[PDB]
Every structure is written in structure tokens, then in C-alpha cells.
Design a protein around this nucleic acid. Sequence first.
RNA 1: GCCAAUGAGGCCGAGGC
Length: 125
Amino acid sequence: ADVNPKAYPLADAHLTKKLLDLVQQSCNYKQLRKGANEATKTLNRGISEFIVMAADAEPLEIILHLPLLCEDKNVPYVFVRSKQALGRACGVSRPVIACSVTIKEGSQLKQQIQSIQQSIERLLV
RNA sequence: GCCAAUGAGGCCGAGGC
């Protein structure tokens, strides 16, 4: 397939699993926003922990505006390979091009939310 | 069943039938 270079950073097989797993969990803690639109707002509103996007979005440009807003807001972001997998991670029978894990005070997901973020840093070496 | 976060359908935010 040859993953679009514009899709950086890209979660490796392992990190994707965890990524997808936290995504599903946040879903239950009512701490997950799906869709580029909603994702973007979470950023502008400053309530986003990190953003996950799908390298197989088509055309990728549909979301390429997100990393910039992320850089401008200092919110870590990552790309997973499939919008389907991300889809079912969000509990959606449809593909999800991007989602944003929200900031909830007191959430127990914190130790985990921090572990992805940190994982994400390491990706930027 | 079908449509649907590449946006339900009444900015909000995962439902419609």
C-alpha cells in the first residue's frame, strides 16, 4: 500500500493496539469525540488529551489540517493505519478518519492517557 | 436490514427508519 509520508508519526503494530484500546475505553468513560469536525473543536476548546487519525483517510488532506492545530496547541497526535479499526475502536460500524480523547478531571484513564502521550514522544526522536 | 462521525438529524454531538 505504501503509507502516505504525510502521515507522521505512525503508530507501530504494538502501539496501535494500545492506542485502539484506550480509544475504546475512553468511549465508555464518555471521554471520546469522533470525527474530524468534533476532533478539531476539542482542540480549539483546549479539552483534547491527544488526537488519533487514520493514515488511510482519502484524500489524506481531509485531516492534514489537524497536525498544525495540534502543533499550534501543543497536543500530541498519532496516525493509525486503518479507519476501520479506529472505527470499531470508537464502537462505530463505519470508518473513523480521526477522533480526539477528551480531558476529564478525575478520570482513572490518566495513567493510560499519559502512557500514550509519552509513547508518542518517543516516536518523535 | 439500510443510511451514518468522509457526519446522525434537531451550533449541539449518535443517532434516523
